[PDB]
Amino acid sequence: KVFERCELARTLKRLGMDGYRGISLANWMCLAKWESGYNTRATNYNAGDRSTDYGMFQINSRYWCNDGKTPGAVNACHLSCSALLQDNIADAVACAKRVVRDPQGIRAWVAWRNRCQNRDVRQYVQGCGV
Structure with missing residues (x-):
């Protein structure tokens, strides 16, 4: 799914992202904009270390999620990278x-x-009333 600017702001805010660890909502927004364009199905393969970035935040498979095909992978987030390509971003946020x-x-x-x-x-x- 490709979220619209304010649709995302309002959602990230209800999921407790605004000010999370001193990070403002605008900063989380800026990250998502450049990482995927607000597209939950975004992906990027890294040939050097054989990992893949998934989702709106482009979370790498080597340390954060398990995709089953990355060498020396850890699953710090303890979830299938697959869950990070979903329309419901609750998992991506966590x-x-x-x-x-x-x-x-x-x-x-x-x-x-x-x-x-x-x-x-x-x-x-600006303009999202967040």
């Missing part, structure tokens, strides 16, 4: 919360650092 619980925080995602960190990201939520 797993995104776990990722940012590690010391690196949201900086775990390179895209966020290159496109969101230290930049005005207010555009992502």
Whole structure:
């Protein structure tokens, strides 16, 4: 499913993402925008380490989810990567919360650092009444 801007904001907010670990809703929005364009079915294969990024937040199969075909995989989120390609993002959010619980925080995602960190990201939520 491809969420619309404010549809996503309102949802991420009811799922407790706004301010989660000091991370504002606009920052979670900015991450999703650049990682997948708000598309839950987004995927990206990484040839170097044979892993795949799944979903709206592009959660990697090597450490966070199990897809069954990645070498030396851990399943820190304890879920099938398959669950991260679903229309209902409740699982993707829970797993995104776990990722940012590690010391690196949201900086775990390179895209966020290159496109969101230290930049005005207010555009992502202005007009959503969130």
